[PDB]
């Protein structure tokens, strides 16, 4: 739940379900940049042609 990409620490002492930061931060940055690029309204106002 902390990050997308995590680690399974098997030290024969416990179970460390850690999470990375760099790669998942790059992935979230790229995906939110993709949505900032695409999810946008039009910049041209149209007109009603038919009736």
């Amino acid at each position: 739940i902390d990050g997308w990409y995590g680690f399974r620490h098997q030290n024969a002492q416990g179970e460390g379900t850690a999470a990375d930061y760099k790669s998942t931060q790059s992935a979230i940055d790229c995906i939110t940049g993709k949505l900032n690029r695409l999810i946008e309204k039009t910049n041209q106002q149209f007109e009603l042609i038919d009736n």
């Binding site: 690029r37 039009t42 041209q44 149209f46 007109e47 042609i49």
Partner: protein, 101 residues
Amino acid sequence: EFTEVEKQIGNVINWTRDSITEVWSYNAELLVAMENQHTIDLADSEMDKLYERVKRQLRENAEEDGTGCFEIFHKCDDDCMASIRNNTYDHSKYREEAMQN
């Protein structure tokens, strides 16, 4: 441009030209973004190709560290650089002297 056309057909022409302008502008933006991404991926792929080709040429004699530099165990001189550069190097000649490191 000089003498104005009938208003209804002029509005139809402007609406069609504006829709075509929107389609071509979106197509140009998607085209530029797609081929810039493909050019960046192509550069990364060619760098990865060169890195793995040098790794296959160097074999076990040089161990990668995680930087792009190769720690060649043999005393690999300038002619050895030329051999690993222009696809001439053989690992079987130098494995005996580079195996103990």
